[PDB]
Design a protein around this ligand. Structure first.
Ligand code: B12
Ligand code: SF4
Ligand code: SF4
Length: 376
RNA sequence: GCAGACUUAAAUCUGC
């Protein structure tokens, strides 16, 4: 009965494109609670997580009388077919692989909906509660306890066949399914991810200072701290460094889901056009990727910083207009700072003009930084 | 229609 239901669920999940499925109980996540209290007090959290620790570690609070959790994982592509070349006149930014093609929030919500349907179509009264990323549970904690993959040193859940390049989701049920056993650590004495992290956000194996992680920094809506502006490169959203150096990901390039295939012109887009983009054109072109959940502003800020990184002089006119006309303090100030960074002294007069008119205190400071740079 | 804010992609509010 319960065993047959479990095998039928696994059979259906694979047919609708789930790459890996696993089972765990609805027991509380005790070690996780202690861990979350630790990270919180160390200031190592991001603020993006659920504030209520009880709801995060107690499945039976989320779904009354729950008895199990079904965890699913989908592998996403890692290599890009015919990536467009970034030249001196035409510089390009880059999205992380978790932001290629169709938003996994929607892809995996679909798989969870079909699996909720499947169970509810058989026995009653099977009750469920699904979630992907935006739920209370820790998708990694569930995936680990369900045997999807092991906790690697880069904090990533890593699977034997697909590596770390997988999306995670889970469904809480009232079915007392038989749980699986967690898989073993494959990292060994390797430390490549820890050593290659540009900001040392990986303070220890399996421990992240989220405030120092590039991925987090690309999604903040305010001014990017001076400390990290030199380490973003041309990233527009997220970071893949602790994964692309990982030996467990060598050869892992799976094209199993067509809608996840990146559009090279929007995954690796031209920087300058992003600066003058309209809301409709952004919604049409970027509105269906995961990296647009905070809006266009963090992406544009990063695009500016990316141009400063490249010292693209051809971006100076658009940056200048942005400094003068844009109603967003973060955009004005960053444009001012980038202008000074690119290093053309001819634009110094324009910085002073902007300075004399700025009313936003923080934007003022960024202009002053930009002026100081151009003197040098 | 355009733009901004906000929580988060269409909802709410504001400006043209
Ligand atoms: C907040 C958040 C972030 C934050 C911080 C992530 C972090 N490491 O804490 C930021 C914005 C930086 C981020 C970045 C990324 N994230 Co993110 N993020 C989340 C989110 C919403 C919650 C994660 C969280 O609460 N972390 C807090 C820590 C404490 O817990 P946890 O890592 O989830 O759980 C593990 C630890 O607690 C550990 N642990 C427990 N006890 C102990 C004890 C010891 C001693 C140690 C060492 C560890 C340890 O074991 C748990 C299970 O592995 C989840 C979705 C979700 N709802 O769960 C996605 C999620 C974790 N992110 C994901 C992705 C894809 C990424 C990025 C790769 C995106 C990118 N390309 O930039 C990067 C990777 C950066 C990295 N190396 O961690 C995937 C991870 C998939 C996978 N294969 O593991 C998730 C699961 C989203 C999803 N639904 O697929 N993200
Ligand atoms: S995503 Fe980038 S910044 Fe964050 S821990 Fe990994 S390598 Fe470091
Ligand atoms: S780089 Fe090495 S230590 Fe880091 S996750 Fe990959 S195998 Fe593990």
């Amino acid at each position: 009965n319960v065993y047959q239901l479990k095998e039928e669920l696994i059979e259906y999940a694979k047919s609708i494109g789930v790459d890996k499925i696993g089972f765990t109980t609805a027991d509380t996540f005790d070690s996780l609670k202690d861990r979350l209290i630790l990270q919180e007090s160390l200031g190592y959290l991001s603020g993006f997580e659920e504030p209520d620790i009880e709801k995060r570690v107690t499945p039976k609070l989320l779904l009354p009388k729950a008895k199990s959790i079904v965890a699913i994982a989908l592998a996403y592509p890692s290599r890009m077919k015919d990536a467009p070349r970034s030249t001196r006149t035409e510089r390009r930014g880059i999205f992380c692989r978790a932001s290629w093609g169709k938003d996994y929030h929607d892809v995996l919500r679909e798989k969870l909906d079909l699996l909720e349907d499947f169970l509810k179509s058989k026995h009653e009264d099977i009750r469920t509660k699904s979630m992907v990323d935006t739920g209370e549970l820790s998708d990694r904690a569930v995936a680990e306890r369900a045997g999807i993959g092991f906790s690697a040193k880069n904090c990533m859940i890593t699977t034997p066949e697909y590596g770390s390049y997988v999306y995670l989701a889970e469904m809480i049920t009232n079915i007392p399914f038989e749980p699986d056993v967690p898989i073993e650590d494959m990292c060994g004495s390797c430390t490549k991810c820890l050593d290659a992290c540009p900001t040392g956000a990986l303070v220890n194996p399996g421990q992240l200072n989220a405030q120092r992680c590039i991925s987090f920094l690309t999604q903040t809506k305010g001014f990017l701290p001076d400390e990290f502006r030199t380490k973003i490169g041309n990233r527009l959203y997220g970071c893949d460094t602790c994964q692309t150096v990982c030996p467990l990901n060598k050869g892992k390039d799976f094209h199993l889901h067509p809608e996840m295939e990146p559009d090279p012109e929007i995954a690796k887009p031209l920087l300058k056009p992003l600066l003058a983009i309209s809301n409709r054109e952004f919604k049409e072109k970027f509105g269906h990727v995961s990296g647009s959940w905070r809006g266009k502003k963090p992406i544009q800020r990063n695009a500016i910083l990316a141009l400063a990184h490249f010292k693209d002089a051809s971006a100076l006119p658009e940056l200048t207009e942005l400094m003068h006309k844009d109603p967003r303090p973060v955009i004005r100030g960053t444009a001012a700072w980038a202008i000074g960074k690119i290093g053309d002294p001819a634009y110094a007069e324009e910085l002073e003009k902007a300075l004399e008119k700025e009313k936003d205190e923080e934007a003022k400071l960024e202009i002053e930084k930009g002026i100081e740079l151009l003197k040098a």
